Amino acid sequence: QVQLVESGGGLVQAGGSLRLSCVASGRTFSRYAMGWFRQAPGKEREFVAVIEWDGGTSYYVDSVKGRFTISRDNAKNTVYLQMNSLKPEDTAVYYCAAGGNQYYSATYSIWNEYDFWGQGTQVTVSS
Amino acid sequence: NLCPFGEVFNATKFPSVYAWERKKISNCVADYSVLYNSTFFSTFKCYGVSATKLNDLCFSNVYADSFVVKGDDVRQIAPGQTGVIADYNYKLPDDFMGCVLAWNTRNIDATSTGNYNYKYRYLRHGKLRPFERDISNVPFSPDGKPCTPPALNCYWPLNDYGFYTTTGIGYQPYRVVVLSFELLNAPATVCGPKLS
Ligand SMILES: *[C@@H]1O[C@H](CO)[C@@H](O)[C@H](O)[C@H]1NC(C)=O
Ligand SMILES: *[C@@H]1O[C@H](CO)[C@@H](O)[C@H](O)[C@H]1NC(C)=O
């Protein structure tokens, strides 16, 4: 079983930046499309971003286009989420997810469609 | 010569998971558009490979495994999953390279009265190794010792899916095809339409 450990979360002022990391165990990381979801208070886990196994294709939820950018390092078993221009709407627990490279891009945004899930790291953006 | 994916995906009958069936696809041209141009797949995802780029790739050999599972069990057909399907019926390797396809078959695998032809193993001494298959039907004992029911502490290791046309989607039947991509240090035998 592949394990996913997020880090880089914490407390940040509105307007600032964070960079989340997620490290997978084992050697199979480069098979997987790696995603980020987030859960704000009172809301379901929501899709944020995905990048396919090879780094070449990637999708974002609209509310983060131009602010967030996802990337990966197959040599380090690590997926990254660069988060700029943070707003209080971004306050949430950020979850890393690993799954298959999907034929329908829309499937990427369904949490249950992945294979493995991290336990999350909290991000709080103070007003 | 086209690869015989039709024979796989359009087979009239599909097996139970515990008795899953493998067809070797080799020495042929794979036109994966047959899976692109059919839009009934509710699962379609690949590992180590972009699902939309399959026509651009060559493989040493392709293996097609067919079987039926419950809708809520489809998710166990992936690398590193746990549960009775993935641990006692069909296990993919950690480093799986290939694709998982599935489609809802309520209208041919489910019934008003209930279809019980499809079975899975739920009792076993030890997990299967990747791509291993166990089709025995031996009375199961927690002692491991052989037993003959109605003897006590003696159980039958298989159990039925009950597929009714009126249950929720997670309980309806899904046909699954796993495509394994084998990579060897030789010429490739299964290539896409314009690759050679
Ligand atoms: C199954 O048969 C249909 C009907 O012709 C065909 O269009 C489809 O491509 C076939 N599927 C496969 C896997 O060949
Ligand atoms: C889907 O379209 C492609 C090219 O447009 C074609 O090669 C393939 O045979 C089509 N599949 C069908 C009609 O099943």
Tab-separated table of C-alpha atoms in Angstrom, chain A residues 1-2 28 30-32 52-54 57 99-104 112-117, chain B residues 36 39 41 44-52 75 78-82 94-97:
chain	number	residue	atom	x	y	z
A	1	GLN	CA	0.000	0.000	0.000
A	2	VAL	CA	1.276	3.455	-1.056
A	28	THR	CA	5.667	3.314	-7.809
A	30	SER	CA	5.601	7.717	-11.232
A	31	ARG	CA	2.696	5.456	-12.289
A	32	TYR	CA	0.082	7.798	-10.802
A	52	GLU	CA	-0.597	13.166	-14.763
A	53	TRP	CA	2.129	10.570	-14.168
A	54	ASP	CA	4.600	12.258	-16.553
A	57	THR	CA	-0.972	17.342	-18.515
A	99	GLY	CA	-4.928	7.493	-8.765
A	100	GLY	CA	-4.942	6.437	-12.368
A	101	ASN	CA	-4.477	8.674	-15.368
A	102	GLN	CA	-8.086	9.240	-16.410
A	103	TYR	CA	-9.599	9.087	-19.861
A	104	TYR	CA	-12.216	11.696	-18.964
A	112	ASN	CA	-13.653	8.560	-4.734
A	113	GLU	CA	-12.098	7.941	-8.162
A	114	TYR	CA	-8.544	7.853	-6.777
A	115	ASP	CA	-6.713	4.909	-5.227
A	116	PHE	CA	-4.896	6.396	-2.211
A	117	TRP	CA	-5.413	9.453	-0.052
B	36	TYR	CA	-12.404	5.777	-27.305
B	39	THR	CA	-18.559	5.940	-24.543
B	41	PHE	CA	-17.092	3.063	-19.837
B	44	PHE	CA	-11.224	3.993	-17.754
B	45	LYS	CA	-7.845	4.826	-16.251
B	46	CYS	CA	-4.214	3.854	-16.738
B	47	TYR	CA	-1.057	3.490	-14.673
B	48	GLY	CA	2.283	4.665	-16.100
B	49	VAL	CA	0.556	5.665	-19.304
B	50	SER	CA	-1.772	8.429	-20.358
B	51	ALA	CA	-5.182	6.933	-21.131
B	52	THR	CA	-5.717	9.183	-24.149
B	75	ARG	CA	-12.288	0.344	-6.899
B	78	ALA	CA	-6.147	-1.159	-8.726
B	79	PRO	CA	-2.568	-1.498	-7.474
B	80	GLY	CA	-2.112	-1.693	-3.714
B	81	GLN	CA	-5.786	-2.085	-2.828
B	82	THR	CA	-6.947	-4.197	0.100
B	94	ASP	CA	2.412	-2.534	-7.020
B	95	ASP	CA	4.192	-1.564	-10.246
B	96	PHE	CA	1.228	-2.311	-12.528
B	97	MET	CA	1.465	-0.797	-15.997
